[PDB]
């Protein structure tokens, strides 16, 4: 799923050095991105959406239940007229991407946080350089407005989601020559108000300066689409305890890269449950975070973990692997990882996995382990006392693995909270109704706005008409659509047309055809008694 955000604002009317405006260059770049992505044999399941800088009823051009034909037709007729309302457009796009999330089961907020339930989405937000306006002045903060929150959105406290990356294109093409071609293989950043918003999600922001640089950035962007598993790392709290082959001193601490969870839907178990201590009676649930604040500690702690535990291959995208490569990729050794923010009743973090590398030393495998592996792996009334340290709802998925061996547990203590189940079906129904109402009025514009609003300065109610583009005057049916110049000739033409008594008469003077004239479409409505047997 790819949602292209093209502003089509009035500031996108300035002409480049090639002769076309920035909007035409953006549309051409989108078309070349389409034809480049079509090369990879994986573009048979994705869906394209379009978002412009227009009113909430008119911002979306093609959303759910819209094929490629209507999407291309809407992107073709894009007009650059309006202000640069970036915040409202980003909010509308994020709400559109989060319409079918509370109904299928993604981010249920009650049963862990399953990383194998993915809904990838990439935003391009092709906008102008700077100087965004909000009908009052020029702002320099880019704060997303919060006026009408969706039902069930206060449990994340952030507009974007687990898998929602945000790339940006500014299209800073000069007007005279664009002769800046010193650095060949180098794509700098835009350094604008959208740069922090993009970096928070996990995607960079390109700075287009030349058509060659545009082609380079488009060819570099097609290689950044996969399953979205974005997790945040922190150096705390080990004081860079990497004393293995050298001495530490770094910027590879707050790594917020993605992870490629390739399927073999995705197959996996043992998710990151949450970051708080869930109580048995809690009417209000604390809001989750889109990026989990999980921290790693550099300790050997028996990296050899061999068992019949179901295996996972959530591949990690190499972005800050320099710190690992400095220590020879940690051969035959790993380092634990633990989620912060009160992972248990009374403690600060519980190691639930590690980041052991592969034998090929190519990337990090991201070995996800159970909540507390070094205890259950090595019954004398031990498991009954051990199952009290883990979160309650967490007994859900692990028991499935126990199904591979037997079934000692039951549904006696399989209860998260009596108040968490309530006020959940109503929120899901409200979200479904909102998604249906949004998908219903998605393409039907029905503007019907043509007036001059004649002010005084039949009274207080007059309004002069405006020039209608698609008027289609009926010359043979309506007599008012016949001007004075070609009146007598048109009169004789109408007379001859009425006195001819032909078959299948029409009221159009000369209606040649539409913009498209297909050969197969016209040849299908015919009959040819021939087969060419010879």
């Amino acid at each position: 799923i790819l949602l292209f955000l093209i502003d089509t604002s009035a500031s996108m009317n300035q002409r480049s050095h090639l002769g076309t405006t920035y909007l035409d260059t953006a549309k051409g770049a989108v078309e070349t991105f389409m034809k480049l992505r079509a090369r990879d044999p994986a573009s048979r399941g994705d869906r394209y959406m379009l978002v412009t800088f227009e009113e909430p009823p008119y911002a979306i051009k093609a959303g759910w239940k819209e094929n490629h034909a209507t999407f291309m037709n809407e992107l073709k007729n894009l007009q650059a007229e309006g202000l640069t309302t970036l915040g409202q457009s980003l909010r509308t796009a994020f709400d559109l991407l989060n319409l079918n999330r509370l109904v299928t089961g993604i981010d249920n907020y009650g049963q862990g946080r399953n990383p194998f339930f993915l809904e990838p989405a990439i935003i391009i937000t092709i906008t102008d350089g700077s100087k965004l306006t909000t009908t009052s002045g020029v702002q320099d903060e880019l704060h997303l407005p919060l006026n009408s929150p969706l039902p069930g959105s206060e449990l994340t406290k952030e507009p974007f989601r687990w898998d929602q990356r945000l790339f940006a294109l500014v299209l800073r093409l000069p007007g005279t020559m664009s002769v800046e071609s010193e650095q060949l293989t180098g794509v700098p950043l835009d350094d604008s108000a959208i740069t922090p918003m993009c970096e928070v999600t996990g995607g960079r922001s390109y700075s287009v300066c030349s058509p060659r640089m545009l082609n380079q950035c488009l060819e570099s962007l097609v290689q950044k689409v996969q399953s979205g598993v974005v997790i945040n790392f922190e150096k705390a709290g080990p004081d860079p305890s990497p004393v293995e082959d050298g001495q530490p001193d770094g910027s590879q601490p707050w790594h917020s890269c993605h992870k490629l969870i390739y399927v073999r839907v995705p197959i996996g178990h043992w998710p990151v449950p949450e970051s708080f201590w869930p109580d048995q009676n809690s009417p209000t649930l604390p809001p989750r975070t889109s990026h989990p604040v999980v921290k790693f500690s550099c300790t050997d702690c028996e990296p050899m973990v061999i068992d019949k535990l179901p295996f996972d291959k959530y591949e990690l995208e190499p972005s800050p692997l320099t710190q690992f490569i400095l220590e020879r990729k940690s051969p035959q050794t790993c380092w634990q990882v633990y989620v912060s923010n009160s992972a248990k009743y009374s403690e600060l973090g519980h190691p639930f996995g590690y980041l052991k590398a592969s034998t090929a030393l190519n990337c990090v495998n991201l070995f996800v382990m159970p909540y507390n592996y070094p205890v259950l792996l090595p019954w004398r009334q031990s498991f009954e006392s051990y199952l009290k340290t883990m979160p309650p709802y967490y007994l859900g998925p692990l028991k499935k693995a126990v199904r591979m061996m037997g079934a000692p547990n039951l549904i006696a203590d399989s209860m998260e909270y009596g108040l968490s189940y309530s006020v959940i079906s109503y929120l899901k129904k409200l979200s479904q109704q909102a998604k249906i109402e949004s998908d219903r009025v998605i393409g039907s514009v029905g503007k019907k706005v043509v007036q001059e609003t004649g002010i005084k300065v039949e009274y207080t109610g007059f309004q002069v008409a405006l020039l209608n583009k698609d008027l289609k005057p009926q010359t043979f049916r309506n007599a008012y659509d016949i001007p004075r110049r070609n009146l007598l000739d048109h009169l004789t033409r109408m007379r001859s047309n009425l006195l001819k008594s032909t078959r299948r008469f029409l009221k159009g003077q000369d209606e040649d055809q539409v913009h498209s004239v297909p050969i197969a479409q016209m040849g299908n409505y015919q009959e040819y008694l021939k087969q060419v047997p010879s």
Binding site: L488, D489, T492, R493, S496, N497, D510
Partner: protein, 56 residues
Amino acid sequence: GQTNRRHTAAVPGPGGIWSVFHAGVIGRGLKPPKFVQSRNQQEVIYNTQSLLSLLV
């Protein structure tokens, strides 16, 4: 240097029973002005001489 009376007296395609032969006009055709700059050759360079003398 640099309406309908005439259209009615010759209408009905000379048949009074069919439509016109053509199918309309595109714009106007046969631009009336078609004027060319032919004011004068002499006494034009002397105005330029006077202007250059003023500028000098």
